[PDB]
Amino acid sequence: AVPSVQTFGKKKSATAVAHVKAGKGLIKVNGSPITLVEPEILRFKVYEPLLLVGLDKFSNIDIRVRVTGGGHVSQVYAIRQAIAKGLVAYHQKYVDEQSKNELKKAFTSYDRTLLIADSRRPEPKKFGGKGARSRFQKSYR
Amino acid sequence: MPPKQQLSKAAKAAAALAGKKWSKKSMKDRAQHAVILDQEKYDRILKEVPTYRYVSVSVLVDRLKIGGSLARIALRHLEKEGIIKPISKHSKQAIYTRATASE
Amino acid sequence: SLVVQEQGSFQHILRLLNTNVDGNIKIVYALTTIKGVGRRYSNLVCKKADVDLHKRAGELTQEELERIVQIMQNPTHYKIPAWFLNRQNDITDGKDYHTLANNVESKLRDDLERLKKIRAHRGIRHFWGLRVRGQHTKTTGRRRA
Amino acid sequence: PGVSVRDVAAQDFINAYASFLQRQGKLEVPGYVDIVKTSSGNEMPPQDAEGWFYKRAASVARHIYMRKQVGVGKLNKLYGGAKSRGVRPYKHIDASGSINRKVLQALEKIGIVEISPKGGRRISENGQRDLDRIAAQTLEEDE
Amino acid sequence: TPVTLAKVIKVLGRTGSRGGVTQVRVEFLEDTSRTIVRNVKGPVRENDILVLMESEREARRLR
Amino acid sequence: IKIRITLTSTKVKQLENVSSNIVKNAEQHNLVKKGPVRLPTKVLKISTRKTPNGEGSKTWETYEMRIHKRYIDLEAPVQIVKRITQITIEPGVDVEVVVA
Amino acid sequence: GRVRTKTVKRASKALIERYYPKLTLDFQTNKRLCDEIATIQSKRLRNKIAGYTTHLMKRIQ
Amino acid sequence: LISKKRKLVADGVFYAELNEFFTRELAEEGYSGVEVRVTPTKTEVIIRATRTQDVL
Amino acid sequence: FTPVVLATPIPEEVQQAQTEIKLFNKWSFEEVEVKDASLVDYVQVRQPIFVAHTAGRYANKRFRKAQCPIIERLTNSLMMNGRNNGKKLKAVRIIKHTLDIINVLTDQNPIQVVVDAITNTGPREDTTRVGGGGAARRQAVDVSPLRRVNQAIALLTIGAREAAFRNIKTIAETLAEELINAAKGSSTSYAIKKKDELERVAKSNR
RNA sequence: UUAAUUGCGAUAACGAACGAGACCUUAACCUACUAAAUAGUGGUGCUAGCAUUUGCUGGUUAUCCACUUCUUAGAGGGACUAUCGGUUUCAAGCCGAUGGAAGUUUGAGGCAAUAACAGGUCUGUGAUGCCCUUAGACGUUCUGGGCCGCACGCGCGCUACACUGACGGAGCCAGCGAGUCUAACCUUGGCCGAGAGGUCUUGGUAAUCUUGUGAAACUCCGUCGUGCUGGGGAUAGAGCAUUGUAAUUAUUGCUCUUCAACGAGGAAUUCCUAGUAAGCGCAAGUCAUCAGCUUGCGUUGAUUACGUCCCUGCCCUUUGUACACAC
C-alpha cells in the first residue's frame, strides 16, 4: 500500500513502463543496473535526468522501468522519457511543487521531449517506389 | 509513327560483329612493410617513440614502416613497460601518448 | 611483453606443392596459393597439425614443413572426415581424392575429355566453350573473344 | 546487494566464465568441434578453438538464466547470421544444431541446467547457485 | 585583404534566372549612415552580418 | 456450467447493438458476468492491380476486410443456459455458443 | 492557405444575422451553442463554422 | 472447424453467388435485392421483386 | 561536492559531470569564443549538450538547422557516402576519437579548435551560375554566413574522408589533422585550398 | 489572396449545379466513461540463489486481492490556425513568439467534374457482332521438346570495387501479417546429423501455439592489412538431401575446391524536402519446389532548398494565325 506512481515512455515505437516509488535510490533498468543500457557512448543520455537536477530527488524514491519495442537508440530514448516522466509524476503526486516546477522548467530548457512524446511516427508507403516518396527509376526512349 | 528502318541481314551482321578499355592505375607503388621485428627495428622503437606526442597504429606504420599486426604487439609491449600513457581504448583505434614527467 | 628477434629463420620463397609461395604472411593463409587447397582446408590442416596458427609462413621450420607436406600428400590415414575432398567418390578409383596444385587441372581436363568422348551434351557444350549450367546468355557474357 | 548476472556486465561475465571453465577443465568436449562452421552463413571456422566451446557454454548458461526456457531452435535462430548467398542479398539462416545440442548436453552432465516442463530447459539449483557465485569474484575483480 | 563587416536591414528580393541570388540593402557598423546594395548567395535574414571584400562595388539586378 | 458466447461480424454498429442487448439480458436477474472485452481488429488485406492487362500505370489497391470479435462469458446454474439461449441475430452477425 | 469555404461563410453569416444575443466572444461557449442549434454532421465542419463566427464577432464588435 | 476469417469470406462468396445467380434467373421479374440472414438452426433468405406473384 | 552513491553503484565521474555544466565529461563547453561577429548566431557556444547524438527536427524551419549543435552538425555531415548511412553511434564514436586527437596534439579545447577551423576555412566570396546567351559568363556574389558554415563543414568532411580513403590512417585521425591544419591556417588542408581557389575564381570574375 | 472558379471585391446580371472543397480511413493525445485471464501491472502463497535485512533478480491458476498507466477498441473530447505583436482595398489573407500530443487545409491515402484518345484488352468473363474452321478440325486429351535457345545493342535491380573496411566471437531490440480435419499448414520440444536436413512427439481454425517470428543494418572484443590482399565468388569439378510421376538445360539448399572483370565509371541521364532520402531486414503475392520482382511493414537515419520560370512542362488574360488529324 506504499504510495507509488507509474507512467509511459515512447520515442517512435518503444513503450517503457515505469514504477517510480519510494525507496533507497534503486535505479536499475530492466532489472539491470543503470551502468548497462547499451551504447557505451549514449550512456550519458539516460544519465542526463540524474545530473541536470541532482541525485537528492532520486535518493528518496526508486525507479523500475521495463521497456519493450523499437530498437537500441529508440530504446534508450524510451527509458529516458519514461524515467523523466515517472520522476515528475512522483513530483506532482507526492512531492512539494516548488521543486517540481523548477525541475520541469530546467527539463524543458534543456530539451522539450523529456516530458513530451515525440510526434514523428512512421507513415504508409506508396506504390511505384521502395520508399514513401522516392519512386522507381523511369527511362524514356 | 514512321516505320522503323529495318537493317539488312549483312548490315546487322556487320554491326554485331564489332561488339577493350584499360585502367589508369594512378596509385603509387606498394610500400614495402616489415613483417619481422629485428634488432634494428627494436632499438629504434625503444629509442625514438618517446619523442612523439601522438602515438597510434597509423602513425607507426606510416613512419617506422613495420607491419600493422606487429604494431599492435609493439604498442602492448610499450604499454606494459609504461613508456606511453593511454587516453582512449578501442578495438578499431588506440590512443597513446608519451609518458611526460608531469601528471 | 611478447617481442622476439631471431637472427635468421625466414625463407622468402617456399616450394610447397609445386607453387611459388612468398612469405610475410600468416602460415594459416599461406596455403591458399596452392591450387586445390583453400583457406578453410589450410586452417583445418594447421589446427590439426598444431603448427602455431598465429605465425608467419617464411620462418617455418623443415620438420613442420614436412608434416604439412605429407598431410597434403594424404589426408585419409589421419582420420580426416570424408567431407573435405574435391573428388568425393572418384569415378576412376572409388576412393575419395584431393587432387592438388599439379593435379586439379589434369583431372579437370581428364573428365572434360571423358564428357567430350561420350558425346554428352555437357561435354559438347564445354568443347564449344559456352555456358554449361542453365545460364541465360542472352544478356550475359560479351567480353570472351 | 545480491550480485547477480543481471547486475553483472555481459563481457566481464563472459571473460570470467571463459577463464573459469578453462581453468577447471571439466566440460565434456565432444571432440569433433574443431573444424565445423557452426552456420552455413559463416565463412571461417573457429579461431580461438580451445576456448570456443567454453565461450559457447558460458553464453548459453547466461541465456537460460536471462530467459525462462530457451530451446535449441531459439539458440540456433539467435546465433545464425546473414549468409552472403553469392550475388544474392543477405538473409537470416539458423546456426548449427549439433554443436549447440552437445553444449546443452554438456551443461546437463555438469549440473548447470536440468530439464524443464513446457518445452526447453531451465537453470538448475546448482546452476543458479554457481551463476550467482561467480558474480561475486567477477565483481570484486574490478571493484 | 581589407574586410568590412556589414549588417543587413532589408532584403529587396530574389533575383536571377534560377533564383539563387537575393538582393539586399546592407550597411556596416563602422562609420555607419551610408549603405550599399549587395547580392547574397545563401539564405539571408535581417540583422545578419556579412564580410565584404569590396566597398565601392554597388551591384545590379542579376539575370 | 460455463457458457461463452462469441460474436463475429464486419458491422461494428450491429455488433455493439447485439453486445449491449446481451449485456442487458444477462444483467437481468443477477447472472454475474464480465462485460465487453475488445479484441484487436483483424484487418485482412488483398492486394490487386487495376488494369486487367499489362498496359497502364502500375496501380495497386488493397481491399480490406474489417471483422470484429467480441465474446462474453457467463457463469450460472442451468437457468442461464435457457434464459440466454434466445437468439437475437441480425443480418451479417454471427454467434457461437460454447459450453464448458 | 486557410481560406474559409463559401459554405461555412454562408453558415457563419446566417448565424450572425440571427443569433447576436446568443453569440458571444468566447470560442468554446458559442461552439457548444452551435452544437445545440446548428445540425452539422461533422465535428470538424461545425468547429470551423464556430471559429468563423468567433472571428466575425471580433471583427464586427 | 473453419477459421473465422475463412468462414466470413465463404459467407461473402455465398452472398455473391446468390446475387449473381438471382440476377441471371429472376430477369423478367426485376430482381432487386437479397438478404442472407443466418441463424444457427435455420438460415433465412429474403427476396425483393416487383412482381412477387410470379415468384409465387 | 555530492559523494552520494545511493543504492546502485554509480561511477564517480557521473557526479563529477553532474557538479558543473555538461562539459562533454571531458571538454569544458565554456571558455569557447567565436571569430568576427559575421559568423555569430550560427555557431552556438552557449548551449552545452552531453552527447553529440540527438533527434531534433532541425529541418522543420528555415533556421532551425542554425540551432543544431555545431559538433552535432559535424557528426551528421560525416554520415554520407551511401553504405555509411545511419550508424550515428559509430559516427559520434569517430568524432570522440577526433576530439581525443585534437586534445593530444597542440593541446586546446576540441570544440574551440573546431570553431576556429570552421571560421578559418569559410568561403567569404563565391561565384554563381549565370545564363550564357552566347557565352558562359559567371558573376561574383557574396554568401550568407550560414551558407559559409555549410561550405566549411562540407569541405572538411569530404576532404578528410577522401584523404582517409584507401589509406591506412583512420578517418578520425585524418579529419583531426585536417581540422588542425585548417585552424592553424596551413595551405595543406583540402578545405583551405578549395576556399582559396573559390576566392580566386570570384575575384577573377569580378 | 489561396494549392483551388479559395474567398474579399467590383460588375448585364441573378439564381445555381459538378469538381476542388466538403467527406471517409489511417498515424499519433486522453491517468475521462466501459473494461479484458485469448494482455498485463502491483501485492498475498510455494518459492531458487545472493544477501543474511527489511531487500534484489525470478518462476509458478484453480495460490488468491486491487487496477487499466502500459497492450486493444466502442462511444467521445480535442486543433478551429487559439492568445499576443504586427502586415494587410489595412476585408480576405499573410508574417513571427507563446502555450502546445498535434499550427505548411496536422501528415498520408480513398473517392475524385465535362469532353476526348481510333491509347491497351475478342490471350479474364457461358459478354461478344462479322470473318475462318467443325471430324486425319484452329475443340479436348496423351508423350517429348519449346517459351531458357546466341554474333550483339538497350531498361528496370542485386553484388562489390574495402579500412566509416573484411572475417570470428559475444550484447543484441521491432512491426505488417499468415497458418490444417479429412485436409494434411505454421510448426514447439527431444533425438539422429557440420550443414542441407530426417525421425518421434507438442500446440494452434487462432491476441490464446508457431512468435517476443530474440531478423539484419547495429554495439563491444579479437585477427587482417593498403597487397586486385583475408573485399569479389562471376565462371567452374566432385559429393550429400529436400521439392517434384518426371531435376538432363545443373528447381533449390549444403561441404570442399578455381578465385575472372571491378582500383569511384566519360557522352548523357533518374528520384527526393523530413521518420524525407539513403542503408538494412521482415510479412504477403504467385508456390508440389523455386526471389536478385512487386505489394506493405519495421530499424539506423544526413546534408541542402523555404526561391524561380533559365531547361523541360501546367493554369488564366491579351494579341497574331494562311493552324482544324489543330507546329
| E49 touches I at CB < 8 Å | yes
- Please state the φ and ψ torsions of residue C18, each to the nearest 5 degrees: 60, 50
Q: Do residues A132 and A125 touch, judged by C-beta distance below 8 A?
A: yes
- Does I150 sit within 8 Å of E43, measured CB to CB? no
Pair C5, B38: CB distance under 8 Å:
yes
**Host H or E run for residue E12:** strand E4-15
Phi, psi of H43 (to 5 degrees): -95, 135
Cα angle at B8 between B7 and B14, to 5 degrees? 90
- The CB-side HSE value for H17 (13 A sphere, CA atoms) comes to 6
Tell if the CB–CB gap between H38 and F94 is shorter than 8 Å: yes
In this structure, the dihedral spanned by the alpha carbons of residues A139, B2, B3 and B9, taken in order and rounded to 10 degrees, is -80
Distance from CA of D47 to the nearest CA of C (A): 9
Please state, in angstroms and rounded to a whole number, the distance separating the CA atoms of residues F45 and F61.
10
CA distance I88 to I66: 20
Q: Are A47 and I11 in contact (CB under 8 A)?
A: no
Give residue numbers, 77 to 116 of C, with CB < 7 Å from strand J: 81, 83-91, 104, 107-108, 111-112
**Complete DSSP assignment for F40-84:** PPEEEEEEEES-SSS-S---EEEEEEEEEEEEEEEE-STTHHHHS
> How far, in Å, CA of B53 to CA of B66, rounded?
19
Residue E50's φ and ψ, nearest 5 degrees, are -130, 150
Residue I73 dihedral angles phi and psi, to the nearest 5°: -65, -40
B9: region left, alpha or beta (phi > 0 left; psi from -120 to 50 alpha): alpha
Neighbours of F17 (CB within 10 A): 14
CA A85 to chain centre: 8
Nucleotides of J under 7 A from a protein CB: 1-4, 6-8, 20-24, 26-31, 34-38, 41-42, 48-51, 53, 55-60, 69-75, 77-83, 91-94, 96, 101-105, 107-111, 119-124, 127, 148-160, 162-165, 167-181, 187-197, 205-207, 211-212, 214-230, 232-240, 248-259, 261-264, 269-282, 285, 291-292, 294-310
Q: How far apart, in whole angstroms, are the C-alpha atoms of residue I100 and residue B86? A: 11
Chain A 90-109 residues in 7 Å CB range of strand J: none
Residue–nucleotide distance: I87 CA to J289 C1' (Å): 39
Q: What share of chain C is helix, strand, coil (3-state, %, to 5)?
A: 35, 5, 60
Residue nearest to nucleotide J197 (CA to C1'): D97
Do A and D make contact via 3 or more CB pairs under 8 A? The reply is yes
| Cα distance between residue I100 and residue I109, in whole Å | 10
Domain assignments of chain I as residue spans, ordered by start:
1-206
Helix residue ranges, H only, chain E = none
Find chain A residues with C-beta within 8 A of I7's C-beta.
Answer: 23-27, 62
**C-alpha dist (Å) from residue I110 to I12, I24, I100, I118:** 24, 11, 8, 12
Topology classification of domain B37-99: Arc Repressor Mutant, subunit A (1.10.10)
DSSP code per residue over C100-113: -TTTHHHHHHHHHH
| Dist CA I120 CA I39 (whole Å) | 11
Task: Report d(CA E25, CA I142) in Å as an integer.
Answer: 13
Q: Is the shortest CB-to-strand distance from I193 to strand J under 7 Å?
A: no
* Contacts of I among chains (3+ CB pairs under 8 A): A, B, E
Please count the structural domains in chain A: 1
Residue nearest to nucleotide J239 (CA to C1'): C88
**Residue located via cell numbers 627494436:** B42
- Which residue in this structure is represented by grid cell 565461450? D55
Nearest to I168 among B27, B54, B58 (CB): B58
What are the boundaries of each domain within chain H? Answer: 4-56
N residues, chain C: 145
**Pairs across C and D, CB distance < 8 A:** 17
Q: Do D45 and C48 touch (CB under 8 A)?
A: no
Burial environment of residue D128 by CB neighbours within 10 A (0 to 12, 13 to 18, 19 or more): middle
- The values of phi and psi at residue B90, to 5°, are -155, 155
Cβ(A11)–Cβ(A118) under 8 Å?
Answer: yes
> Cβ distance B35 to B67 under 8 Å?
yes
C69 is near strand J: CB distance < 7 Å: no
List, in order, residues 6 or more apart from B5 with CB less than 8 Å away: none
B4 CA from J327 C1′ (Å): 23
DSSP C20-53: -EESSSBHHHHTTSSTT--HHHHHHHHHHTT--S
Side-chain half-sphere CA neighbours of D20 within 13 A: 15
Residue H54 class from Cβ within 10 Å (0-12 exposed, 13-18 middle, 19+ buried)?
exposed
Helix extents (H) in I21-170: 70-77, 88-104, 110-120, 145-164
Closest by CA to A114, choosing from A138, A91, A93, is: A91
Residue H38's contacts (CB-CB under 8 Å, 6 or more residues apart) are F89, F91, F94, H11, H44
Closest residue, CA to C1' of J155 = A139
b/e per residue I43-64 (b: at least 16 CB within 10 A): bbbeebbbbbbbeeebeeeeee
Q: Which residue of C has its CA nearest to D46?
A: C43
| HSE value, Cβ hemisphere, 13 Å, CA-based, for I87 | 13
> What is the DSSP track for C69-82?
HHHHH-SGGGT--T
- Distance CA(I88)–CA(B37), nearest Å, equals 38
Q: Report the distance separating Cα G53 and Cα G15, nearest Å.
A: 7
What does chain G come to in residues? 61
Query: Which residues contact residue C31 at a Cβ distance below 8 angstroms, ignoring those fewer than 6 apart?
Result: C16, C37, C41, C42, C45, C46, C68
Coil/strand/helix, residue F31: coil
- Distance in Å, alpha carbon of H1 to nearest chain F alpha carbon: 12
Alpha carbons H45 and C128: distance in angstroms, whole number: 72
Phi, psi of D141 (to 5 degrees): -65, -45
Solving technique for this entry?
Answer: cryo-EM
Angle at alpha carbon of residue C22, lines to C20 and C25, rounded to 5°: 140
Give the three-state DSSP class for B56. Answer: coil
Q: Where are the beta strands (DSSP E) in D70-133?
A: 82-83, 91-92, 113-115, 121-123
Among residues D85, D106, D87, D88, the alpha carbon closest in space to that of D39 is found at D85
Looking at this protein, which amino acid is placed at residue I116?
A: D
Question: What is d(CA I191, CA I159) in angstroms, rounded to the nearest whole number?
Answer: 7
Which neighbouring-strand residues pair with F48?
Answer: F61
For chain D positions 10-69, those within 8 Å of chain A (CB to CB) are 10
Domain limits at A44?
1-141
| Shortest CA gap C100–chain B (Å) | 29
Indicate if CB(A73) is under 7 A from strand J. Answer: yes
Instruction: Report how far residue I148's alpha carbon sits from residue B25's, in angstroms, rounded to the nearest whole number.
Output: 36
Expressed in angstroms, the distance from the first to the final Cα of chain F is 6
Which residues 36 to 65 of D reach strand J, CB within 7 A?
36-44, 46-48, 55-56, 59, 62-63
User: How far is it, in rounded angstroms, from Cα D55 to Cα B12?
Assistant: 66
Contact (CB<8Å) A120/I57: yes
Mutation for B interface: C3, C7, C59, most B CBs within 10 A: C3
CA distances from I149 to A137, C7, E22, I144, I200 (A): 34, 57, 18, 9, 19
- Superfamily classification of domain H4-56: K homology (KH) domain (3.30.300.20)
The chains in contact with chain A, meaning 3 or more Cβ pairs closer than 8 Å, are D, F, I
Amino acid (1-letter code) at residue D105: Q
User: Which residues, at least 6 apart from B40, have a Cβ–Cβ distance to it below 8 Å?
Assistant: none
What does each C-alpha distance from C105 to C35, C36, C69, C112, I131 come to in angstroms?
9, 9, 20, 10, 65
Q: Which set of grid coordinates corresponds to residue A140?
A: 524514356
8 Å CB contact between D104 and D113: yes
Q: What is the DSSP string of G7-31?
A: HHHHHHHHHHHH-TTT--S-HHHHH
Coil vs helix vs strand at I205: coil
Q: Collapse the DSSP code of H35 into the 3-class scheme (helix H, G, I; strand E, B; otherwise coil) and give the result.
A: strand
- Nearest Cα residue to G37 out of G55, G14, G60: G14
Partner residues linked to F63 by β-bridges:
F46
Asked if residue D102 keeps its beta carbon closer than 7 A to nucleic acid strand J, the reply is no
Say how far apart CA B72 and CA B81 lie, in whole Å: 14
Domain housing F47 = 1-100
C-alpha cell of I37?
A: 561577429
In Å, what is the separation between the CA of B1 and the C1' of J314?
26
Q: Which residue has the cell 611526460?
A: B100
Q: Which member of I100, I166, I170 has the closest CB to residue B88?
A: I100
Distance CA I26, CA I48 (A): 12
Q: Are strands B84-89 and E49-52 parallel, antiparallel or unpaired?
A: unpaired
- CA dihedral over A136, B1, B6, B7, signed as positive or negative: negative
Which residue of chain I is at minimal alpha-carbon distance from A23?
Answer: I7
Q: How many CB atoms lie within 10 A of CB A30?
A: 16
CA A93 to chain centre: 19
**CA separation for the pair D21, D10 (Å, rounded):** 17
Rounded Cα–Cα distance for residues I170 and B68 (Å): 13
Instruction: Classify residue B8 by its DSSP letter.
Output: P
Sheet bearing F42-49, strands edge to edge: F42-49, F60-75, F2-9, F94-99
Backbone angles phi, psi at C113, to 5 degrees: -65, -35
Q: Which amino acid, I55?
A: A
3-state helix, strand, coil in chain E (%, to 5): 0, 50, 50
What Å resolution does this PDB entry report?
Answer: 3.4
Those residues with Cβ within 8 angstroms of residue D94's Cβ, 6 or more apart along the chain or in another chain: D39, D73, D76, D77, D79, D80
Whole-number Å distance between alpha carbons of B48 and B60 = 11
**Angle between helices D125-140 and D10-24 in degrees, nearest 10:** 110
Distance CA A50, CA A57 (A): 9
Name the nearest CA neighbour of B56 among B81, B31, B90, B26.
Answer: B90
CA distance B43 to B37: 10
User: Can you tell me the distance from the alpha carbon of A102 to that of C92, in angstroms, rounded to the nearest whole number?
Assistant: 89
All chains having 3 or more CB pairs closer than 8 angstroms to chain F: A, H
C-alpha radius of gyration, chain F, whole number? 19
